[PDB]
Ligand binder design. Structure first.
Ligand SMILES: CO[C@@H]1CN(c2ncnc3[nH]c4cc(F)ccc4c23)C[C@@H](CO)O1
Length: 167
């Protein structure tokens, strides 16, 4: 048993809810929250900028030190940093940016990072401002992640569409 509430069970291990990941994280304080990041860990907008704003920019300060030491992430890669006031840990995961010409087949690689964590709160990767279709993103997730993933979908129209079109 875990503390995630009102989630709609989609498969053995994938759950979905119409919720803002920032508000979900603040309420649940999960072991792992996933950030949909970029290779530079530049959290200006979207999930990244919203989580970072919720940390009062502490996520960005920590991220800048990480990059100065280690250099950029790979598209499809990840790093574990602090969850600040939102979670124990933040798993920063880079899905492909299809508006940058980045291989959509790297989205599966992005979601493989989730398998290193038994339970995660996560958004849909590569959709929204990375240009890919949310319906496709949810499909890749279900077919790749084997650990227990709680998906917070911010847009109600999309959530209703993701559920209604789920095979
Ligand atoms: C489909 O992928 C992304 C997922 N994203 C979110 N998902 C879950 N919770 C979210 N809270 C937010 C607060 C914000 F200010 C901005 C975005 C979100 C958000 C919505 C959109 C962002 O571009 O697309």
């Amino acid at each position: 048993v875990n503390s995630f509430s009102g989630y709609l069970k989609l498969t053995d291990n994938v759950y979905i809810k119409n919720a803002d990941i920032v508000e979900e994280a603040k309420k649940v304080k999960p072991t792992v929250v996933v950030n949909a990041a970029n290779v530079y860990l530049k959290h200006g907008g979207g999930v990244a900028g919203a989580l970072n704003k919720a940390t009062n920019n502490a996520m960005q300060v920590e991220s800048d030190d990480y990059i100065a030491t280690n250099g950029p992430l790979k598209v499809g890669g990840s790093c574990v940093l602090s969850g600040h006031n939102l979670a124990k840990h933040c798993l920063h995961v880079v899905g492909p940016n299809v508006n940058k010409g980045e291989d959509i087949q790297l989205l599966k690689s992005a979601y493989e990072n989730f398998n290193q964590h038994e339970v995660l709160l996560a958004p849909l990767l590569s959709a929204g401002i990375f240009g890919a279709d949310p319906i496709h993103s949810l499909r890749v997730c279900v077919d790749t992640v084997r650990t227990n993933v709680y998906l917070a979908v911010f847009d109600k129209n999309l959530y209703d569409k993701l559920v209604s079109s789920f095979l």
